[PDB]
Ligand binder design. Structure first.
Ligand SMILES: O=C(O)c1ccc(Nc2nccc(Nc3ccccc3)n2)cc1
Length: 267
């Protein structure tokens, strides 16, 4: 914003998470008593990994996004050693931990998460921003249990040519991305299909024991449903996981989906 913060402005609390490049802490701003989360990253690690520009990309995009379903970035600042991102704080945790805890979601919590998500993504895409990292570990919970997309680390503007050496799990990545081609916002809808399935089933539909094998699964779009996935969930997920991006529906079609409406508690 208009202001320049510094570490001495904040009391750091209990650590929320420990990433590869740094950790997230609860923290309070001394003068306002304001509660939020401080993301501490290391110039050393960011440098060695050559992500500095991608970090820039994160800060710009996220800082400029306002939406109930997106985690706000208020600002940032650096010192000799590390980099500090000042983030809105989501008091109920990741969707990942919800999923470990419950191991499966009912159609209603899933349709709801999928709705909030679709809305969020909608807002993003209207700006030509594609997230590309949508996974439950990157999804957080607000005071009211409402879903918030955090961690804009891999997002970019569309279309993208990006071949970025793929670091983590392919589990949420569409064929066009793993295969090194150019991609557009449809990426996120593929991901939404992956997410939907993981929410209902407890594991992402392409899970394998090796990168190479999972990569095969995604490329050939090989998945199957447990018997307890209702036909409506199957239809939404099947429409969402299409080798052809242009065959994948649009967030309007998702929000307007019969299964979504018969289930979601949130418009
Ligand atoms: O008690 C926990 O588990 C937990 C509690 C709150 C929380 N909220 C939060 N808010 C803003 C950013 C952020 N980053 C983050 C993302 C994933 C894991 C850890 C931190 N987390 C995360 C975890």
């Amino acid at each position: 914003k208009k202001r320049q913060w510094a570490l001495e402005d904040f009391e750091i609390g209990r650590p929320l998470g420990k990433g590869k490049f740094g950790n997230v802490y609860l923290a309070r701003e001394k003068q306002s008593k304001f509660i939020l989360a401080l993301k501490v990253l290391f110039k050393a690690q960011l440098e060695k990994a050559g992500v500095e520009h991608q970090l820039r990309r994160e800060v710009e995009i996220q800082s400029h996004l306002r939406h109930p379903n997106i985690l706000r970035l208020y600002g940032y600042f650096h010192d000799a050693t590390r980099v500090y991102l000042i983030l809105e704080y989501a008091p109920l945790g990741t969707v990942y931990r919800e999923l470990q805890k419950l191991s499966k979601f009912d159609e209603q919590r899933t349709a709801t998460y999928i709705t909030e998500l679709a809305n969020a993504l909608s807002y993003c895409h209207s700006k030509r921003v594609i997230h590309r990292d949508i996974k439950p570990e990157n999804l957080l919970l607000g005071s009211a249990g409402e879903l918030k997309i955090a961690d804009f680390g891999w997002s970019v503007h569309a279309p993208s040519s990006r071949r970025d050496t793929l670091c983590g799990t392919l589990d949420y990545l569409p064929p066009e991305m793993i295969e090194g081609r150019m991609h557009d916002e449809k990426v996120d809808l593929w991901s939404l299909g992956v997410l939907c399935y993981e929410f209902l089933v407890g594991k992402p539909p392409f899970e394998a024991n090796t990168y190479q094998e999972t990569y095969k699964r995604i490329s050939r779009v090989e998945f199957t449903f447990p018997d307890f996935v209702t036909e409506g969930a199957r239809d939404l997920i099947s429409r969402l996981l299409k080798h052809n991006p242009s065959q994948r529906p649009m967030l309007r079609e998702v929000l307007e989906h019969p299964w979504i409406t018969a289930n979601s508690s949130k418009p």
